Amino acid sequence: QGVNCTEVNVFQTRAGCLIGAEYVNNSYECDIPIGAGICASYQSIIAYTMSLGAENSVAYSNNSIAIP
Amino acid sequence: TNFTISVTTEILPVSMTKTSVDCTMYICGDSTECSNLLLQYGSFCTQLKRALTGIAVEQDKNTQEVFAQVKQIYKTPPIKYFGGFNFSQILPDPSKPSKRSPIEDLLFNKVTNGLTVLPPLLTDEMIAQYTSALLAGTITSGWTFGAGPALQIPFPMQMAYRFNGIGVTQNVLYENQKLIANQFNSAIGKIQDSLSSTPSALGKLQDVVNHNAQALNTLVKQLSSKFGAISSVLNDILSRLDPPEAEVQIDRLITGRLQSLQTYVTQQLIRAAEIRASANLAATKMSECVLGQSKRVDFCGKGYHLMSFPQSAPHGVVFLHVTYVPAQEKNFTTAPAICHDGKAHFPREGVFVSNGTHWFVTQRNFYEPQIITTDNTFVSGNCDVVIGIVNNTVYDPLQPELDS
Amino acid sequence: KQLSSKFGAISSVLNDILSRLDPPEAEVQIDRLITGRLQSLQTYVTQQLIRAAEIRASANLAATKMSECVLGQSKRVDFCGKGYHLMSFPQSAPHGVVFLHVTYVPAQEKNFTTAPAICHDGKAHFPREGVFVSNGTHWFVTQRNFYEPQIITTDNTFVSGNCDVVIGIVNNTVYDPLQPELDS
Amino acid sequence: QIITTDNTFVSGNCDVVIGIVNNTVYDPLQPELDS
Amino acid sequence: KQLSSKFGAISSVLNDILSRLDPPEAEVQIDRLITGRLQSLQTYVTQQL
Ligand SMILES: *[C@@H]1O[C@H](CO)[C@@H](O[C@@H]2O[C@H](CO)[C@@H](O)[C@H](O)[C@H]2NC(C)=O)[C@H](O)[C@H]1NC(C)=O
Ligand SMILES: *[C@@H]1O[C@H](CO)[C@@H](O[C@@H]2O[C@H](CO)[C@@H](O)[C@H](O)[C@H]2NC(C)=O)[C@H](O)[C@H]1NC(C)=O
Ligand SMILES: *[C@@H]1O[C@H](CO)[C@@H](O[C@@H]2O[C@H](CO)[C@@H](O)[C@H](O)[C@H]2NC(C)=O)[C@H](O)[C@H]1NC(C)=O
Ligand SMILES: *[C@@H]1O[C@H](CO)[C@@H](O[C@@H]2O[C@H](CO)[C@@H](O)[C@H](O)[C@H]2NC(C)=O)[C@H](O)[C@H]1NC(C)=O
Ligand SMILES: *[C@@H]1O[C@H](CO)[C@@H](O[C@@H]2O[C@H](CO)[C@@H](O)[C@H](O)[C@H]2NC(C)=O)[C@H](O)[C@H]1NC(C)=O
Ligand SMILES: *[C@@H]1O[C@H](CO)[C@@H](O[C@@H]2O[C@H](CO)[C@@H](O)[C@H](O)[C@H]2NC(C)=O)[C@H](O)[C@H]1NC(C)=O
Ligand SMILES: *[C@@H]1O[C@H](CO)[C@@H](O[C@@H]2O[C@H](CO)[C@@H](O)[C@H](O)[C@H]2NC(C)=O)[C@H](O)[C@H]1NC(C)=O
Ligand SMILES: *[C@@H]1O[C@H](CO)[C@@H](O)[C@H](O)[C@H]1NC(C)=O
Ligand SMILES: *[C@@H]1O[C@H](CO)[C@@H](O)[C@H](O)[C@H]1NC(C)=O
Ligand SMILES: *[C@@H]1O[C@H](CO)[C@@H](O)[C@H](O)[C@H]1NC(C)=O
Ligand SMILES: *[C@@H]1O[C@H](CO)[C@@H](O)[C@H](O)[C@H]1NC(C)=O
Questions:
Q1: How far apart are CA B273 and CA B106, in angstroms?
Q2: Do E31 and B270 make contact, defined as CB atoms within 8 angstroms?
Q3: Which residues contact B291 (CB under 8 A, 6 or more apart)?
Q4: Burial class (CB within 10 angstroms; exposed 0-12, middle 13-18, buried 19+) of B245
Q5: How many A from CA of C136 to the centre of ligand 5?
Q6: B26-29 long-range CB contacts below 8 Å, 24 or more apart?
Q7: Cβ within 8 Å, pair A68-C142
Q8: Is B200 in the pocket of ligand 5 (CB under 6 A)?
């Protein structure tokens, strides 16, 4: 917790530094919180940026309506 | 006979700063005699640590519950023409590298041993992304996206729906759309100008930050208190006095510092409970006054509700209610019923209003007179039982329709 | 577990202290044990009171939810279930309650071309309760949450204003049911 | 109130609504077009 | 009511305990008494909160 571990796979977060887990470029939906949006899970143990949700883009026009 | 749209802002705290403490580091620090003596007091460390971790988890759930109400991050279309409504002061700007709206930037610029501070799970960028997604969803999909899939609805159409939801028909918006667009833009401009006009506008967020900082400062300041002992240094008492009196002096110091820590923990628990109640209120307002239109009077804004927008704030949320204030009234003379051919007549949805000579039926909140017709009236009973009735004729389309 | 803590006394067992010591020192040993256990009990009562206040708030919210979503239908969005709310059933639970929200969730959307109003013979027409939806050739009204096209009829439309102040209108005729009725 | 076409709206056919009943419905503008 | 309790001290009156006893032990006795009174005040403040 809040230690720049240069005096003790080593990854650095804004909540501290993490030992024993690697980093993944892609983002997954997470379950275990850490702090500063770097969630950790178990697919070894991986740590990733929090998935904010699906990047759904909705179109728009001024004469377009959608009815279920 | 006229309407004025006013934009009012309200501020609700969401979550304050998480705090975790260390027992031995705050109480003793380095002296192992204090660490040996603390074990005599029993389990007065695990209780405090569990309580403070529970506070941290509860505040994390608080800051998650009010913003994470959508499962899809919605993208605002690159074009910003919605039909005359200038939505540039609250949408994110790509020029700023922080993905910060000017309202969000104005809000963010107006807020300023053994005691670690855990960072929040959600940083400023992710809650900014949630607020941008919510604003995009309520600006391009109406209130449907809070129920199921988002549907593309034009902005004037769902504005007409929001007028139809407050008892005014959609024959008042499409006639002066330029005027209502000008009023909306002027309202956004004046709330931007007057949000930072007074330093007491952002009262609650500054208050919760100031109380948290003062509580932590008072906790730190207790380390330089003698508590009835010779000195306030653990190393000074142990290396100068005999152990029979050092035992009593250290015991007095430990019970004083433990009482201070218990008082701080109780204060933090009370403050966190209050913040959780305010966060539940903010979550209800998020799920009611943003994802849809609420018909409760004076719950979101001083007036009839149309829609509202969320804006991210440091350790809190800031709303922009868009109300409907019907100023500039003009009075008339009325009657509850109209008698014609011996049978009573009643208004279907409006009220019978006479300007002195003739009679008209009009909506309950906008003076738009119409000729009384049998299509928007219904008959019931006779002319004797109802009181206050007046004599007047009723227009019927079949009388000029048949003879043609 | 606070019973086994010595609290800086000779021993945690009280009868041992009363059976091993004279009252001149048993008085101060008793005093230390009493103040330690009283502080522990004060902490326990404070935590219990806070948790009971939290449970009171949650139970008030649950009673409001029961009174507004079982005894009736609540029109406000996303208070009882994720979507339009129909009705709910309560279920008994040990030290709690469990609801069963029954929600109305639309699906299978379809693209359509709209217009705010229709102009006919110089006077504008507006939908009484729906919205003008065109599939490309003809124009129909439909209710806002389910697709059900109907022919444009003067009974479910009302006229207001001229053909100029309203923007974005389209040209289409309006079926008047009285004209063929009078032709028979 | 007497059942008219003013307070009713038509939809579909008489083959799918479960529990329907047989009854004629009064219509307005009837003793009017022939007079 | 809690104002007039002994709190494990010799007495519950300030003038009675600051006169008869010797100050090396009267200081400890009155320290215990004001500690008890402060604890009672803290309990009342927490209840009021
Ligand atoms: C209703 O009020 C609005 C403003 O509150 C009026 O709009 C003004 O109209 C005058 C014309 O006499 C213009 O000079 C002003 O610039 C308008 N104000 C704005 C903000 O655009 C409007 O005339 C009033 N009446 C109606 C029927 O809408
Ligand atoms: C639908 O919206 C688009 C913008 O998304 C409109 O495009 C505008 O066209 C006019 C033509 O004079 C330009 O002046 C605007 O600058 C354009 N939009 C922008 C970027 O502001 C389009 O006209 C709209 N069509 C309607 C009203 O149905
Ligand atoms: C929406 O309103 C804002 C604010 O009134 C407009 O931003 C102004 O733009 C002009 C011209 O670029 C500048 O001279 C002002 O300094 C801007 N004001 C602020 C506060 O930034 C913006 O142009 C408007 N957008 C539209 C499409 O009308
Ligand atoms: C009450 O309203 C009616 C119509 O809204 C007014 O009648 C009109 O008056 C003007 C003024 O001379 C005439 O040009 C119109 O032909 C009248 N309409 C008709 C006869 O259908 C009436 O004057 C108003 N009364 C008052 C006292 O203002
Ligand atoms: C509306 O017109 C009717 C016409 O019948 C009025 O009823 C008559 O009113 C006079 C004056 O009070 C009585 O002497 C008659 O006995 C009434 N006849 C009937 C059949 O009721 C009625 O008063 C008028 N109402 C108003 C408000 O002017
Ligand atoms: C839009 O919907 C209308 C209504 O169903 C369609 O019109 C029908 O087209 C079929 C195909 O020949 C005809 O058999 C029907 O008689 C038409 N209906 C009426 C009431 O005349 C129209 O084809 C649809 N357009 C598109 C592009 O799908
Ligand atoms: C519907 O059709 C009529 C046909 O007359 C259009 O009216 C013409 O509109 C143009 C451009 O607005 C004018 O230059 C003509 O003078 C109009 N003719 C008449 C007889 O008034 C009308 O604009 C059409 N409506 C839409 C929405 O396209
Ligand atoms: C840790 O220290 C090194 C060297 O002092 C520094 O380069 C690095 O930025 C520090 N870590 C963080 C997260 O700032
Ligand atoms: C993630 O991507 C960045 C940019 O390409 C790269 O520098 C980094 O090494 C990647 N992470 C891992 C674990 O390889
Ligand atoms: C109501 O109308 C009357 C005339 O009909 C007028 O004298 C009076 O001032 C009006 N009331 C108000 C509050 O304007
Ligand atoms: C409707 O049209 C838009 C743009 O043309 C498109 O992005 C969207 O996928 C369409 N929806 C359906 C259901 O086809």
A1: 29
A2: no
A3: B69, B138, B143, B145, B146, C77, C78
A4: exposed
A5: 58
A6: B26/B113, B26/B114, B26/B115, B26/B257, B26/B261, B27/B114, B27/B254, B27/B257, B27/B258, B27/B261, B28/B234, B29/B113, B29/B114, B29/B234
A7: no
A8: no
What is the rounded distance in angstroms from the CA atom of residue E41 to the CA atom of residue E27? 21
CB spacing of B119 vs A57 below 8 angstroms: no
Say yes or no: D33 contacts chain C, CB-CB below 8 A.
Answer: yes
Write the DSSP symbol of residue A55: -
Which whole-number Å values give the CA distances from C159 to B82, B176, C32, C127, C155, in the listed order? 26, 17, 89, 9, 11
> Angle at which helices B243-289 and B46-65 pack, to 10 degrees?
20
Beta-strand relationship, B316-324 and B304-313: antiparallel
All partners of chain C with 3 or more CB pairs under 8 angstroms: A, B, D, E
Interface residues of chain A, partner chain B, Cβ below 8 Å: 1-2, 14-15, 33-37, 50, 52-68
In angstroms, what is the resolution?
4.2
Measured over the CA atoms of residue B359, residue B364, residue B366 and residue B370, the dihedral's sign is negative
User: Could you give the CA distance from residue C120 to residue C158 in angstroms, rounded to a whole number?
Assistant: 12
Rounded Cα distance, B175 and B160, in Å: 11
Whose structure tokens read 């009196």? B245
A29 closest CA partner among B71, C53, B97: B71
Output the furthest CA–CA distance in chain C (Å, rounded): 120
Rounded Cα distance between B72 and B137, Å, is 10
Are residues B270 and B292 in contact, defined by beta-carbon separation less than 8 angstroms? Answer: no
Measured distance CA(C63)–CA(C97) in Å, rounded: 10
